[PDB]
């Protein structure tokens, strides 16, 4: 496992679905994808409301990311919130592409990779790492 690769593959697949071919363990990638999809299904209207309200530009993208990610993990970490994290970063990338701001995708993948490596690493590692996520989210695979 390498976080940069997990972030890259996740964003790449979200974007390739929209016909956007982005320049940038396989069980891990597929399991997170299905976890991500289950998540956006579970909050389908709320995701629709957040897009219709994102006000995304290159002047705000970093600040939106920083404040949302800080709120998300304010009460601590769990696998469901790491799923929401990936999903949010994916929403940001997708809205960037939809608004013709698609260079922001690179910035966003970098901020995601950084946050995982600098702030999520200890919790992920102490949980047994990405194998633990795979085992947990296997029954919904
Ligand atoms: C702890 C948390 C916070 Cl803070 C947020 C949150 O405010 N947001 C958020 C970010 C920007 C605008 C509105 C909401 C969020 C949403 C999706 C992914 C990441 C962040 N969501 N969460 C959740 C993380 C895991 C599971 C559920 C939630 C959650 O509280 N929600 C899911 C969700 C999905 C899409 C749009 C809004 C929300 C808010 C609530 C729904 N009740």
From Swiss-Prot:
UniProt protein name: Apoptosis regulator Bcl-2
Provide the assembly information: Forms homodimers, and heterodimers with BAX, BAD, BAK and Bcl-X(L). Heterodimerization with BAX requires intact BH1 and BH2 motifs, and is necessary for anti-apoptotic activity. Part of a complex composed of SEPTIN4 isoform ARTS, XIAP and BCL2, within the complex interacts (via BH3 domain) with SEPTIN4 isoform ARTS and XIAP, SEPTIN4 isoform ARTS acts as a scaffold protein and stabilizes the complex. Component of the complex, at least composed of LRPPRC, BECN1 and BCL2; the interactions prevent BECN1 from forming an autophagy-inducing complex with PIK3C3. Interacts with EI24. (Microbial infection) Interacts with Toxoplasma gondii ROP17; the interaction probably promotes BCL2 phosphorylation and degradation.
Tied to what disorder?
A chromosomal aberration involving BCL2 has been found in chronic lymphatic leukemia. Translocation t(14;18)(q32;q21) with immunoglobulin gene regions. BCL2 mutations found in non-Hodgkin lymphomas carrying the chromosomal translocation could be attributed to the Ig somatic hypermutation mechanism resulting in nucleotide transitions.
Motif BH3: which residue numbers? 28-42
Q: Which GO terms describe its cellular component?
A: BAD-BCL-2 complex; cytoplasm; cytosol; endoplasmic reticulum; endoplasmic reticulum membrane; membrane; mitochondrial outer membrane; mitochondrion
Listed result of changing residue 123 to A: Loss of BAX-binding and of anti-apoptotic activity. No effect on homodimerization
Topology of the protein relative to the lipid bilayer: Single-pass membrane protein
> What does UniProt say about this protein's domains?
BH1 and BH2 domains are required for the interaction with BAX and for anti-apoptotic activity. The BH4 motif is required for anti-apoptotic activity and for interaction with RAF1 and EGLN3.
Required for interaction with SEPTIN4 isoform ARTS. Required XIAP-mediated ubiquitination and apoptosis, as annotated region: 27-42
> Record keywords: Phosphoprotein included?
yes
Subcellular localization is given as:
Mitochondrion outer membrane; Nucleus membrane; Endoplasmic reticulum membrane; Cytoplasm
Keyword Cytoplasm tagged: yes
Report any one BP term from Gene Ontology.
negative regulation of T cell apoptotic process
According to UniProt, the tissues expressing it are described as: Expressed in a variety of tissues.
Which UniProt keywords are given for this protein, alphabetically ordered? Apoptosis, Autophagy, Chromosomal rearrangement, Cytoplasm, Disease variant, Endoplasmic reticulum, Membrane, Mitochondrion, Mitochondrion outer membrane, Nucleus, Phosphoprotein, Proto-oncogene, Transmembrane, Transmembrane helix, Ubl conjugation
Q: Please give the function described in this protein's UniProt entry.
A: Suppresses apoptosis in a variety of cell systems including factor-dependent lymphohematopoietic and neural cells. Regulates cell death by controlling the mitochondrial membrane permeability. Appears to function in a feedback loop system with caspases. Inhibits caspase activity either by preventing the release of cytochrome c from the mitochondria and/or by binding to the apoptosis-activating factor (APAF-1). Also acts as an inhibitor of autophagy: interacts with BECN1 and AMBRA1 during non-starvation conditions and inhibits their autophagy function.
């Amino acid at each position: 496992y390498d976080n940069r690769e997990i972030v890259m593959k996740y964003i790449h697949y979200k974007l390739s679905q929209r016909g956007y071919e982005w320049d940038a363990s396989e069980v891990v990638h597929k399991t997170l994808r299905e976890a991500g999809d289950d998540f956006s299904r579970r909050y389908r209207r709320d995701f629709a409301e957040m897009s219709s309200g994102l006000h995304l530009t290159p002047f705000t993208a970093r600040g939106r990311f920083a404040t949302v990610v800080e709120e998300l993990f304010r009460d601590g970490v769990n696998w469901g919130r790491i799923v929401a994290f990936f999903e949010f970063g994916g929403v940001m990338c997708v809205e960037s592409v939809n608004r013709e701001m698609s260079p922001l995708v690179d910035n966003i993948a970098l901020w995601m990779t950084e946050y995982l490596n600098r702030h999520l690493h200890t919790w992920i590692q102490d949980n047994g790492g990405w194998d633990a996520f795979v085992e947990l989210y296997g029954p919904s695979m």
